[PDB]
Paper text:
Lignostilbene-α,β-dioxygenases (LSDs), also known as stilbene cleaving oxygenases (SCOs), catalyze the cleavage of the double bonds of intermediate stilbenes (e.g. resveratrol), yielding small modified benzaldehydes. SCO enzymes are one branch of a much larger family that also includes carotenoid cleavage oxygenases or dioxygenases (CCOs or CCDs) as well as 9-cis-epoxycarotenoid dioxygenases (NCEDs).
The structure of the enzyme determined by X-ray crystallography, and refined to 1.9 Å, contains the conserved seven-bladed β-propeller and 4-His-Fe(II) motifs characteristic of carotenoid and stilbene cleavage oxygenases. The secondary structure of PbLSD is composed primarily of β strands, 27 in total, organized in a seven-bladed β-propeller motif with blades comprised of 3, 4 or 5 β strands. Despite the addition of EDTA to the protein purification protocol, density representing what is most likely a single iron atom at the reaction center of each monomer, is observed and secured by four histidine residues at a distance of 2.1 Å and has a fifth ligand association to a water or hydroxide also at 2.1 Å. The sixth metal-ligand coordinating position, is occluded by a nearby (4.4 Å) threonine (T122) methyl group. In three of the four subunits, the density clearly resembled and was satisfied by water, but in the fourth, the density resembled dioxygen in shape but was satisfied by a single oxygen atom, suggesting partial occupancy. All monomers presented a continuous main chain to the C-terminal Gly481 and could be superimposed with an average root mean squared deviation of the main chain atoms in the six combinations of 0.26 Å. The relevance of the remaining cavities and/or tunnels generally lies with substrate access and product release, and thus specificity and selectivity of the enzymes. In the case of PbLSD, the cavity on the left in Fig. 6a (highlighted by an arrow), and extending from the surface diagonally down to the catalytic site, is similar to that observed in the SCO NOV1 structure. However, it is possible to extend the existing substrate cavity into a continuous tunnel spanning the width of the enzyme by a simple rotation of the side chains of just two amino acids, Lys135 and Asp137. Resveratrol was docked in the cavity with its single cleavable double bond directly above the Fe center, at a distance of 4.6 Å, consistent with the enzyme’s in vitro activity against the substrate.
Numbering used by the authors: -6 to 481
The structure:
Amino acid sequence: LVPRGSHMSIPFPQTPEFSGALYKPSRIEAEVFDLEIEGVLPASIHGTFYQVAPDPQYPPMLGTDIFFNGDGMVSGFHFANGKVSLRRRYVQTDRLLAQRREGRSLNGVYRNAFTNDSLAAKNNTTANTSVIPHNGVLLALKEDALPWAMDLETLETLGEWTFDGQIKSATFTAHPKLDPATGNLLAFSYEAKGDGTPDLVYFELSPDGKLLHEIWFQAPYAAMVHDFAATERYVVFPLIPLTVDVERMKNGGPHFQWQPDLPQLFAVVPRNGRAQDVRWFKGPMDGFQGHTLNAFDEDGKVYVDMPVTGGNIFYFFPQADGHVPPPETLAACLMRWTFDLNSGRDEVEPQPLTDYPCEFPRCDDRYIGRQYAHGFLLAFDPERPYNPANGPIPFQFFNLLVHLNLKTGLSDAWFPGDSGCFQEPIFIPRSADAEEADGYVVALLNLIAEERSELVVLDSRDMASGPIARIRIPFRMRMSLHGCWAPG
Ligand SMILES: [Fe+3]
């Protein structure tokens, strides 16, 4: 390093979080006016697939970092009349612009601003986790701060979005939902009054941005609430056993720490209710709640479907003794939780809906919060062939794109070959008439031995047959986090 002097950018680390087809940095802001398509893209698909990826503008100041900490890079694939175009742009966060001003990374440990350079922006957010259309803009979200608005067509950054000053929490979820009956934005905040606070808030916003209802209450301790579930009548907050200690953070340590002897906790509250209506339920220890597939309620009972994993998958938030289990050890599958508000019992056990591990679930947007029978999922089957030119098996490697029928319990999956894996899918209805889950499943396919990327389109009526269309991208797309479909 010394012979590089002080005027070069420092090298990226040679760690797994910066290596291979999935995690090597890209940093490409791009416009591709027309994409090559193999196969036949249905001409009736009309709208934009937005996705956000962490994609660090600079090598991290500390010489190491986690995937979840990268500057948000939003892609929009716009589908019209059989043609697809791509725009990819950074969210111009205060954090990004400060780093660009200095020409280097100014930010330290994930969600620990005490370890930043004093020239870092005050707002620590990277707006890197999800995207959703709301009130005429695209919101780029990350759960440590308010979201950042972008122009739906150009992906120009509009600024921090405060919802016309109505949202008074310190943070806003990256897992809001759109209510399919009203178009309301259903959202929440944890650590809602600052670092380490136990405050939780539910928010409900009209499609035109008006705050319709809020419910402030407190958890028994500060914990990660990554995703949530909203039904017709209830909201459920899953508190993952990852706890916050501000003193540990002042000393340079991680924002969260896994607690292996702390029950999974759920707060269940009426959607139009108040703090005093909150009820708490407890699940097993040493397990953690994945992303919500869907949820609904009927009579006394709230049902929530999600992956549940039997131990700490977050190696960067280790328990106090430093131990982290080998990810391969951990039992995971899709589960249904049932919260019976009329029962005597606080204690819940999740019931399996699959016998295989999976993540990145997607239901039909039109059935969010309602009784439903279908989900799309990514899964990893370790017995499928794996081309050794892929390199070592990366974090968030999923070699199957799956349609699960909840009525029969059967799965219909596409395997893309031994050099392929997937990013989070979206579902596009075949028409506004179409029955539940009848349409197209669209996802990025990473061809990791070639370091190439395609956006694939499958027909939900026959997933095993593979793509009806493969949209070739002329550069490698880094692994992403969440995306959404915005219908024209
Ligand atoms: Fe998420």
